[PDB]
Amino acid sequence: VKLQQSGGGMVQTGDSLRLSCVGSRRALSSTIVGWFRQIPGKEREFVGGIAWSSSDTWYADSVKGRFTISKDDAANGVHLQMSSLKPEDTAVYYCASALRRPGSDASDYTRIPDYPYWGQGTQVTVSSH
Numbered sequence: 001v002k003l004q005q006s007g008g009g010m011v012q013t014g015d016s017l018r019l020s021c022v023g024s025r026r027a028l029s030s031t032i033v034g035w036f037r038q039i040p041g042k043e044r045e046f047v048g049g050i051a052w053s054s055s056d057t058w059y060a061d062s063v064k065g066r067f068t069i070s071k072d073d074a075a076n077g078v079h080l081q082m083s084s085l086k087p088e089d090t091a092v093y094y095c096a097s098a099l100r101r102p103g104s105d106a107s108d109y110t111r112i113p114d115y116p117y118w119g120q121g122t123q124v125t126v127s128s129h
């Protein structure tokens with residue numbers, strides 16, 4: 001599977017952005033789609049994930065309630081809705097995907113090496129007015 005992400009750019013504090021990530025091959029029942037973000041100077045840090053079969057989601061504390069991942073109703077992809085953005089959210093946002101190992105909870109998929117497949121990144125800079 002290849003992952004394709006939408007554009008980013010500059011946004012202002014308090015604004016929302018809805019990113020898209022689309023897979024080249026149809027989701028499997030075991031597909032997990034994750035979002036990470038590379039804060040400048042830092043590793044790719046986990047944002048949230050979705051389990052395709054159940055639509056179950058899990059998130060990092062730093063984005064809980066503000067960022068929502070959902071499965072597309074009419075495409076083979078997900079959205080990341082990013083609300084109430086602040087300058088500290090400036091990063092490259094990455095879509096990633098995995099196939100869940102039997103016996104491993106989907107919500108355990110929170111680390112970079114848990115995901116073999118990566119999108120190309122969407123750079124977002126949030127600035128004050």
Ligand SMILES: O=C(Nc1ccc(Cl)cc1)Nc1ccc(Cl)c(Cl)c1
Nearest residue numbers: 001021023025026027076077078097
């Ligand atoms: O992973 C997927 N689909 C998928 C769909 C949408 C998103 Cl956002 C992310 C992933 N299917 C798949 C199908 C076949 C193979 Cl070999 C593999 Cl390795 C993966």
Ligand code: NA
Nearest residue numbers: 039042043045
């Ligand atoms: Na950090």
